Amino acid sequence: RTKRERDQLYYECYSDVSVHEEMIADRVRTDAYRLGILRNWAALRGKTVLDVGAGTGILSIFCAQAGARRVYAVEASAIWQQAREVVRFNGLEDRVHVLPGPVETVELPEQVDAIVSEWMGYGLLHESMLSSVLHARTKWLKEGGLLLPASAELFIVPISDQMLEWRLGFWSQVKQHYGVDMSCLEGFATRCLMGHSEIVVQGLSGEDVLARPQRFAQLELSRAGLEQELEAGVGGRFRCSCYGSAPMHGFAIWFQVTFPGGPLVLSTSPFHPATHWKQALLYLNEPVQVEQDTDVSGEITLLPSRDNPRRLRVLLRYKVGDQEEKTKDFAMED
Amino acid sequence: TKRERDQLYYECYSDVSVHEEMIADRVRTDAYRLGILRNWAALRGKTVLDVGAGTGILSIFCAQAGARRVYAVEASAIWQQAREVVRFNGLEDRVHVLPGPVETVELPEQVDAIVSEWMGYGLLHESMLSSVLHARTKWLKEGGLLLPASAELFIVPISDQMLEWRLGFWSQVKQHYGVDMSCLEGFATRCLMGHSEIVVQGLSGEDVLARPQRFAQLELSRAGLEQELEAGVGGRFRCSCYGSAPMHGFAIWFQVTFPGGEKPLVLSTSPFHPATHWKQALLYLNEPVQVEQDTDVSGEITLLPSRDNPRRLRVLLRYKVGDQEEKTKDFAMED
Ligand SMILES: Nc1ncnc2c1ncn2[C@@H]1O[C@H](CSCC[C@H](N)C(=O)O)[C@@H](O)[C@H]1O
Ligand SMILES: Nc1ncnc2c1ncn2[C@@H]1O[C@H](CSCC[C@H](N)C(=O)O)[C@@H](O)[C@H]1O
Ligand SMILES: NCCN1CCC(Cc2ccccc2)CC1
Ligand SMILES: NCCN1CCC(Cc2ccccc2)CC1
Ligand SMILES: NCCN1CCC(Cc2ccccc2)CC1
């Protein structure tokens, strides 16, 4: 668990095909990038581009398609070699240069006019890749250079997870299929499925959402102090009113990023088309009954785990109705 | 280590999800339910040992079938749940949950019957069978009943439709996004087929390229089956392919059979039969091999305990497809 060792296990996660298949099969994600780049054709055409964490090289090829004279495809995972092949195969080794290793130590022969990166982990910040994109902003991007995407926003809403509700109810159904009453295991099932401290990644829809979603932070990637803030913790307070009666199981958070125009939003909301990011769930220890107009408020902080700086931690303080304020501390599931 | 390897194995059964998964599997749970009931005459008035009772469900079916007493032995912390359930259905006086390994537990007597659901992925992953046989030798009366009484293992060549699309994915990129990535096909094959892990996945009869071959039969009451099985089980197989297909390797699966009352009841994990939570276990070739109608596929397979972890299934495979040279691959159960 040295920094080197942990860096090297993280990179190796990207050296297998399955994640790249998943990213690229994510049409919502991949198109937002393709379209987001192509619409900035104006500021790209003949200009220079650093793709932070190029993976298979897809986004770097999009940039060349938008008219960039030269692209630096920087990547620390062994997948750089696959990227190199994709570039040679599409006839582009002259305009797209694959560079192995970390963006923090890579040596480019010049400053760039723009940066592209798909750096977003589950709950936006799991992986901590944003520090790497910001390190690269400060070290390689020219004064008033373009960032794609340029900003990110984070959102929270209380939920009544219908899937979880079905799973907790399961035990009460055992009697009618098999003739054995197992309804007494509901508490156990609740302790197992809600009373842990893991961030749970799951796909929700409208019918899980108990109120108006609230934005609790906004990250302007050009902003001065943003590096320091990520390490100290990003987040904010929130409040909303419940729509009606329901067992509330906790909250979901999700994010969007925004590319500038020639104004394109990539959203991971449960009201919008599904992405491989799904949403990140923060379950309370047990369900709480809510009603129409039940106040639910609190404060949320996303920050690095203590033992692993690439692992997402969420500190959550919250209040439901007339219940006393409570506190829960979560870390991203393995 | 050992105590340690075991506490870790038992801790995988202390969470709710695996029990939910097992009990939501109606094919499994009904087969036990009905396997036990069909055996009413031999349990009525008798004593049973439920090896790995879990939430206690199987012990309760034995009581519902008329067993005078059931000893529910369970080494995972889930035994506390089994007790709560036994008490809740009003059965404390008839089903006794006994915490701990079946190996060291103290029953107050020998039993007339053992019931156990001990089957891992690929039948023998977990190696719970050892536990069941130890209990049989130690605690089962002579002439005693086992449930299920037998197990059989089947292999067949396959073309995994899902895998095919995933290998095909890279050739389709061009059309979805105007970037040719067909050249990653080889890379995908390496990652997806060129490893040495047994892959657990659900197939359908359409993934199957020939007639399934039984390669091993395990008769649980056979004395000396314990030693026999140290070496490993398996055998040779042969079959002929149905048609043109890209062959990706083999699927293996099992069934278990309960004795008739009423005749024998089989619980199958075949891709041709209703899906169960075992799925099948897939043994992939390093790359696909194109086969045709009547292409001969032959080989040999041994399922054996991995060297540093006896609870981890190892499969050794020898095989020949058509006119290609004989090949070899050594597989171990995924994590
Ligand atoms: N500091 C760093 N330097 C270079 N690459 C990095 C990095 N941190 C993360 N990465 C890489 O960044 C990638 C993010 S996933 C996105 C890959 C590709 N751009 C695509 O859109 O499909 C991974 O390939 C990961 O290995
Ligand atoms: N040596 C041993 N002694 C007691 N229990 C064991 C054991 N080896 C495995 N087990 C337990 O056996 C169970 C297998 S799963 C079957 C659970 C339950 N009988 C049902 O049908 O749903 C697990 O709960 C596991 O913890
Ligand atoms: N820019 C990262 C976009 N995705 C990548 C896939 C998910 C994380 C993951 C990495 C590696 C292996 C498995 C899973 C979620 C974030
Ligand atoms: N008698 C075991 C029947 N199932 C139970 C679950 C599967 C193995 C597993 C155990 C524990 C956690 C995850 C997965 C397959 C075998
Ligand atoms: N150690 C006591 C004897 N058991 C008896 C049952 C055997 C089960 C098995 C066979 C083959 C592969 C894996 C698992 C293993 C040894």
**DSSP secondary structure string, B45-56?**
T-EEEEET-TTS
Distance CA A207, CA B92 (A): 42
Bridge partners (DSSP) listed for residue A241: A295
Task: Kindly state whether residues A214 and A191 are assigned to the same domain.
Answer: yes
Last residue of a domain, one of B89, B113, B148: B148
Q: Which of B15, B30, B177 sits opposite A192 (nearest CB)?
A: B15
User: What CATH number corresponds to the domain at position B320?
Assistant: 2.70.160.11
Q: Is A164 helix (H, G, I), strand (E, B) or coil?
A: helix
How was this entry determined?
X-ray
What is the number of CB-based contacts under 8 A between chain A and chain B? 89
Last residue of a domain, one of B89, B115, B148: B148
| CA nearest to B163 within chain A | A18
Nearest CA owner, ligand 5 atom 7? B229
User: Active-site positions of A?
Assistant: 118, 127
- Among B75, B74, B77, B50, CA closest to B64: B50
Distance CA A39, CA A65 (A): 11
Task: Kindly state whether residues B125 and B154 are assigned to the same domain.
Answer: no
Residue A318 Cβ contacting ligand 3 at under 6 Å: no
Distance CA B78, CA A252 (A): 30
Instruction: With beta carbons less than 8 A apart as the criterion, state whether A125 and A313 touch.
Output: no
Instruction: With beta carbons less than 8 A apart as the criterion, state whether A200 and A251 touch.
Output: no
- Among B33, B30, B108, B34, CA closest to B69: B108
Cα angle, residue B165 at apex, residues B164 and B167 outer, rounded to 5°: 65
Secondary structure of B177-206 in HEC code, one letter for each residue: HCCCCHHHHHHHHHHHCCCCEEEEECCCHH
Domain that holds residue A317: 151-334
Tally the domains of chain B: 2
Residue A127 Cβ contacting ligand 1 at under 6 Å: no
DSSP string, B253-315: EEEEEEPP----EEEE--TTS---TT-EEEEEEEEEEEE-TT-EEEEEEEEEE-SS-TTSEEE
Bridge partners (DSSP) listed for residue A155: A215, A254
DSSP string, A165-230: HHHHHHHHHHHHHHS---GGGHHHHHHHHTSS-EEEEE---GGGB-S--EEEEEEETT-TTHHHHH
Q: What count of other Cβ atoms lies within 10 Å of the Cβ of residue A232?
A: 11
Q: Is B21 helix (H, G, I), strand (E, B) or coil?
A: helix
Q: What count of other Cβ atoms lies within 10 Å of the Cβ of residue B135?
A: 25
Buried-state track A266-279, b at ≥16 Cβ within 10 A, e below 16: bbbbbeeebbbbbb
Q: What count of other Cβ atoms lies within 10 Å of the Cβ of residue B31?
A: 22
Q: Is A312 helix (H, G, I), strand (E, B) or coil?
A: strand
Distance CA B90, CA A187 (A): 19
Give B-chain residues touching A172 at CB under 8 angstroms: none
Task: Kindly state whether residues A56 and A115 are assigned to the same domain.
Answer: yes
Instruction: With beta carbons less than 8 A apart as the criterion, state whether A253 and A142 touch.
Output: no
**CA-based R_g, chain A, Å:** 22
Lay out the sheet containing A96-100: strands in order across: A96-100, A70-75, A48-52, A112-116, A141-148
Task: Kindly state whether residues B20 and B66 are assigned to the same domain.
Answer: yes
**CA-based R_g, chain B, Å:** 22
- Among B199, B214, B213, CA closest to B284: B199
Instruction: With beta carbons less than 8 A apart as the criterion, state whether B252 and B284 touch.
Output: no
Instruction: With beta carbons less than 8 A apart as the criterion, state whether B279 and B200 touch.
Output: yes
Backbone angles phi, psi at B219, to 5 degrees: -95, 110
Cβ–Cβ gap B181/A25 under 8 Å: no
Q: Ligand 3 center to residue A183 CA distance, Å?
A: 38
Q: Which two tokens stand for residue B191?
A: 């990652």
Task: Kindly state whether residues A314 and A208 are assigned to the same domain.
Answer: yes
Task: Kindly state whether residues B162 and B141 are assigned to the same domain.
Answer: no
State the DSSP code for A260. Answer: P
State the DSSP code for B67. Answer: B
Task: Kindly state whether residues A286 and A166 are assigned to the same domain.
Answer: yes
Bridge partners (DSSP) listed for residue A242: none
Task: Kindly state whether residues B253 and B281 are assigned to the same domain.
Answer: yes
Cβ–Cβ gap A56/B183 under 8 Å: no
Backbone angles phi, psi at A148, to 5 degrees: -130, 120
The secondary element (H helix, E strand) that includes residue A300 is strand A295-304
Q: Ligand 4 center to residue B28 CA distance, Å?
A: 12
**Is residue B60 less than 8 Å (CB to CB) from chain A?**
yes
- Among B87, B316, B131, B149, CA closest to B226: B131
Bridge partners (DSSP) listed for residue A117: none
Q: Which two tokens stand for residue A20?
A: 């790249």
User: What CATH number corresponds to the domain at position B130?
Assistant: 3.40.50.150
Task: Kindly state whether residues A34 and A91 are assigned to the same domain.
Answer: yes
Bridge partners (DSSP) listed for residue A141: A112
Last residue of a domain, one of A112, A134, A149: A149
Cβ–Cβ gap A184/B84 under 8 Å: yes
Task: Kindly state whether residues B130 and B157 are assigned to the same domain.
Answer: no
Task: Kindly state whether residues B154 and B247 are assigned to the same domain.
Answer: yes
Distance CA A184, CA A172 (A): 8
- Among A143, A148, A85, CA closest to A119: A148
Distance CA B32, CA B27 (A): 9
Distance CA B309, CA B317 (A): 19
Surface-to-core class of residue A311, CB atoms within 10 Å of its CB (0-12 exposed, 13-18 middle, 19+ buried): buried
Q: B19: annotated binding-site residue?
A: yes
Task: Kindly state whether residues A112 and A179 are assigned to the same domain.
Answer: no
Q: Ligand 3 center to residue A333 CA distance, Å?
A: 13
Distance CA B114, CA B132 (A): 8
User: Active-site positions of B?
Assistant: 117, 126
Distance CA A334, CA A311 (A): 9
Q: Which two tokens stand for residue B75?
A: 């080494």
Q: Which of B60, B180, B191 sits opposite A180 (nearest CB)?
A: B60
Segments in A68-161 forming alpha helices (H): 80-89, 129-140
